[PDB]
Amino acid sequence: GSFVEMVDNLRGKSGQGYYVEMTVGSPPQTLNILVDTGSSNFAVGAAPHPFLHRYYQRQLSSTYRDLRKGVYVPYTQGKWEGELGTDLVSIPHGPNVTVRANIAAITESDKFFINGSNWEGILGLAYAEIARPDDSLEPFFDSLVKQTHVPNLFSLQLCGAGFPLNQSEVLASVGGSMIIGGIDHSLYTGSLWYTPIRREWYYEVIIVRVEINGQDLKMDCKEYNYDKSIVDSGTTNLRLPKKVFEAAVKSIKAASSTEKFPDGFWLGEQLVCWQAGTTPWNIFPVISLYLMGEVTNQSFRITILPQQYLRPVEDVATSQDDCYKFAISQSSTGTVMGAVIMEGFYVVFDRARKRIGFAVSACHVHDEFRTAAVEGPFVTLDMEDCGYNI
Ligand SMILES: CCCN(CCC)C(=O)c1cc(C)cc(C(=O)N[C@@H](Cc2cc(F)cc(F)c2)[C@H](O)[C@H]2C[C@@H](OCc3ccccc3)CN2)c1
């Protein structure tokens, strides 16, 4: 591991997001910021909000510059409205550099901030193409690279605990690592496999095959990427296109058929609980996603365990049972490889080489019988046809 200063700089959990500490302004104002590879705006609470115990105070920053422009960002989930400006930004546990970056000062929001998440802003790490108001608003990471010598690459190790973290525990627990400008080899085991970034807007990839316990889901691969497939730390669940979700759930139900679960469970809405330590991991199937490789006609697969797709939640009775929610849900906007999927892997966003790398995470949750995996190569033909074109 060559980036010790950035190792263990993340906190949080899949259900509320993973955040990194940042400072904005002069003198520096410390804020916790949601790491979001699924959007491209850097925005911070800039006005009192019931769920915020701190916010960006522009009038206290001598380096604050007003862009005299409003900004609106409607995500899939919530939304916020703000005022554009620029200011000096640093990452305490990051590269020892300070950059001037665009900042959306959030003045109004709806279903955006999360009670108890401990974060006050969002760091959109994707490309300018999806930045609001438009692509002229340079994203933070682009500014970082243009203004410093930091390599155009970042890597994420999101660490799920495998069990519930109460409010005090999640504040004292290490949630992972965001290595800015490099790859830290202590964060993964085995080899890194790379899939092409199809197009630079979201971190778009192409899934070419899906297996549930080795059984081919057997759908036209274009269905897996309808209308796109993205890697998104800002979404908890693995979200799948309607038809793919229907097929996957039918197969996961068939594989786990020795136990019957209520429809509410499969809808990702209700928890299921087992007596302490008795979660029947073995009845649940592993899920493999095959991704386009960088070599013509070659693919590789990432394999996740139910310890990734079943999200630990506290029992509504705080009892001693081990409880979980099904973290796979339906999408109308394409596949979203969310945080629960990212928790099984060290993910390298190699912007410089337009590729995303995956390796088994040194912090993925597993059991003595099965582990997450990244394996290759596989001969795969016509993978370009798996991509969707509007
Ligand atoms: C339930 C709260 C949120 N949690 C739990 C915590 C992560 C979730 O699991 C969850 C569930 C769903 C169904 C959606 C989102 C979501 O929108 N997540 C947002 C980031 C985000 C927004 C927010 F309001 C609150 C957040 F905690 C994080 C991502 O950017 C999506 C948006 C989409 O790109 C659209 C887009 C639009 C404009 C500009 C750029 C991109 C692809 N990536 C998050």
From Swiss-Prot:
The EC number(s) this enzyme carries: 3.4.23.46
Domain annotation Peptidase A1: ranges: 18-359
PTM characteristics: N-Glycosylated. Addition of a bisecting N-acetylglucosamine by MGAT3 blocks lysosomal targeting, further degradation and is required for maintaining stability under stress conditions. Acetylated in the endoplasmic reticulum at Lys-69, Lys-218, Lys-222, Lys-228, Lys-242, Lys-243 and Lys-250. Acetylation by NAT8 and NAT8B is transient and deacetylation probably occurs in the Golgi. Acetylation regulates the maturation, the transport to the plasma membrane, the stability and the expression of the protein.
One GO term of the biological process aspect: amyloid precursor protein catabolic process
Catalytic activity: Broad endopeptidase specificity. Cleaves Glu-Val-Asn-Leu-|-Asp-Ala-Glu-Phe in the Swedish variant of Alzheimer's amyloid precursor protein
UniProt-annotated catalytic positions: D36, D232
Predominant location category: membrane
UniProt membrane topology term: Single-pass type I membrane protein
Disulphide-bonded residues: C159-C363, C221-C386, C273-C323
Glycosylated residues, chain numbering: N96, N115, N166, N297
Keywords of this entry: Acetylation, Aspartyl protease, Cell membrane, Cell projection, Cytoplasmic vesicle, Disulfide bond, Endoplasmic reticulum, Endosome, Glycoprotein, Golgi apparatus, Hydrolase, Isopeptide bond, Lipoprotein, Lysosome, Membrane, Palmitate, Phosphoprotein, Protease, Signal, Transmembrane, Transmembrane helix, Ubl conjugation, Zymogen
Modes of activity regulation: Inhibited by RTN3 and RTN4.
Localization (cell): Cell membrane; Golgi apparatus, trans-Golgi network; Endoplasmic reticulum; Endosome
Subunit structure, as described in the record: Monomer. Interacts with RTN1; RTN2; RTN3 and RTN4; the interaction leads to inhibition of amyloid precursor protein processing. Interacts with SNX6. Interacts with PCSK9. Interacts with NAT8 and NAT8B. Interacts with BIN1. Interacts (via extracellular domain) with ADAM10 (via extracellular domain). Interacts with SORL1; this interaction may affect binding with APP and hence reduce APP cleavage. Interacts with NRDC AND NRG1.
Job description of the protein: Responsible for the proteolytic processing of the amyloid precursor protein (APP). Cleaves at the N-terminus of the A-beta peptide sequence, between residues 671 and 672 of APP, leads to the generation and extracellular release of beta-cleaved soluble APP, and a corresponding cell-associated C-terminal fragment which is later released by gamma-secretase. Cleaves CHL1.
Entry remark concerning the domains of this protein: DXXLL motif is required for a proper endocytosis and retrograde transport to the trans-Golgi network, as well as for regulation of lysosomal degradation.
Membership in a protein family: Belongs to the peptidase A1 family.
Protein known as: Beta-secretase 1
Organism: Homo sapiens (Human)
Lineage: Eukaryota, Metazoa, Chordata, Craniata, Vertebrata
Span within the parent record: 58 to 447 of 501
